[PDB]
Structure formats: C-alpha cells, structure tokens
Enzyme design. Structure first.
Site, PDB file in Angstrom:
ATOM      1  N   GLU A  58      66.054  57.981   3.658  1.00 57.54           N
ATOM      2  CA  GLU A  58      66.384  57.733   5.068  1.00 57.54           C
ATOM      3  C   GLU A  58      67.457  58.673   5.627  1.00 57.54           C
ATOM      4  OE1 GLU A  58      64.741  55.836   7.183  1.00 57.54           O
ATOM      5  OE2 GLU A  58      63.444  54.951   5.643  1.00 57.54           O
ATOM      6  N   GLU A  67      70.857  59.490  13.133  1.00 56.02           N
ATOM      7  CA  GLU A  67      69.521  60.106  13.099  1.00 56.02           C
ATOM      8  C   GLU A  67      69.546  61.516  13.690  1.00 56.02           C
ATOM      9  OE1 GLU A  67      66.636  57.687  15.245  1.00 56.02           O
ATOM     10  OE2 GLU A  67      65.205  59.297  15.400  1.00 56.02           O
ATOM     11  N   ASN A 105      66.613  45.126  16.226  1.00 53.80           N
ATOM     12  CA  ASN A 105      67.151  45.117  14.863  1.00 53.80           C
ATOM     13  C   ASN A 105      68.665  45.112  14.853  1.00 53.80           C
ATOM     14  OD1 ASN A 105      64.309  45.902  13.582  1.00 53.80           O
ATOM     15  ND2 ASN A 105      65.767  45.651  11.919  1.00 53.80           N
TER      16      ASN A 105
END
Length: 205
Positions: A58, A67, A105
């Site tokens: 990830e 990210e 989330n």
C-alpha cells in the site's frame, strides 16, 4: 511482546519514511488486543507478516504517507452518505499504512477509535499513532470488497488470498489485476521468511 522485533521490522522496511516508527506500531497494538495474539506463535507471526506485507504494498515499503497520485484525490467523497465530506470534496485520499481512503471509511474508523477523522482526516498523515491505528482498525474490522476481516482470513486459516480480497479484491482478484496480487504475495513470502514462519494455504485470488 510483539512477535516482530525491531531488527525484523527494519529488515522488512529498509526504506520507510521516519513518520512510521517501530514504536508507533507497538504502541498501537493496544487498540486491537487479538491482533498478532490469536493462535500459535507460527500463526501470530503469519498474521503480523500478512499485515505488514499488505502495508508495504500500500505504501511502497512504508516510503509514502499520503497517496501519491494527486489527480485522483477528488474521487474519494461518497456524497450518498448522510454525513458527507465535511473536510473537503478531495480530502479523503489515502493516508498511512493501509492508505485509508473514502469519507465513509474515515467516519467509521473515527467512530471506532473515538477520534473525529471525518472532520479532520489529516490527522492520519500527521500523527503516526493515529495512522498505525487506522491500519489495525481496517485489518481487524473491515470486509471491504471481500467477505471477512483480514484478521480472520488469517486466524481462520482461510488463506492470505483472502486478506488481498478484503483489502482490494474488487480491483485486484479474479484477474482484476494480477500484477498487484503478486506484489502482495511476494512481500508476504519475504516477510514470513524474515520472521521464520510459513505462508500457509490459498495465497492468491
């Protein structure tokens, strides 16, 4: 005391950003006392490896906090959720060891951890302990595009394949993207080897 020694942690992540520390990880273990604590030593090591392998994939070996591709930041705000995207339409991009993403989330993870991550999602990129915890959160309570918690996938000897499915399944399994399935498994082989444990069955999806 955690089945992963610091030496091992480092061996797995020789390129990790200083944001992510071994001590950060160990401190966060509290939050989920079953994690890397259920089953035998072998299974305990297997889960730890399975988690970190997935983390590694990830975040590019824990090199990255937020990210990378900013272009797709604006795409993680599900406005059909009642609580919306208070912190911004493009604020729910991936952060931390499991690259937690999506307003839904952040909300859910926030509730579970008694931190308001929906209103302030940046806490994940800012606070290591928060960030580790969001990882363990997901690992231990989320089904995602699969049908169990990664934690059970391992503890029920259901196979590493299943951790892949519940972390990204939709995109990756069933031919979705076998490049990425392989990355995950490879890291899983490397890491289990590092801890002296076995990978167990059904590695793929």
């Amino acid at each position: 005391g955690f089945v992963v020694s610091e030496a091992q942690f480092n061996q797995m992540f020789p390129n990790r950003n200083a944001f992510y520390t071994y001590k950060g990880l160990t401190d966060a273990l509290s939050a989920y006392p079953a994690f890397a604590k259920t089953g035998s030593d072998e299974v305990k090591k297997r889960e730890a490896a399975a988690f970190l392998a997935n983390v590694s994939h990830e975040t590019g070996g824990l090199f990255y906090i937020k990210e990378v591709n900013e272009a797709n930041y604006p795409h993680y705000c599900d406005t059909t959720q009642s609580y919306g995207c208070p912190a911004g339409q493009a604020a729910y991009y991936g952060r931390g060891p499991i690259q937690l993403s999506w307003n839904f989330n952040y909300k859910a993870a926030g509730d579970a951890l008694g931190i308001n991550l929906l209103a302030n999602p940046y806490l994940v990129e800012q606070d290591p302990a928060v960030a580790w915890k969001t990882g363990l959160w997901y690992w231990n309570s989320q089904n995602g595009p699969g049908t169990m918690t990664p934690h059970n996938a391992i503890v029920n000897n259901a196979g590493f394949g299943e951790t892949i499915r519940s972390i990204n399944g939709a995109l990756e399994c069933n031919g979705g993207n076998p490049a990425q399935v392989q990355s995950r498994i490879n890291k899983f082989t490397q890491f289990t080897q590092i801890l002296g444990t076995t990978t167990g069955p059904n590695l793929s999806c």
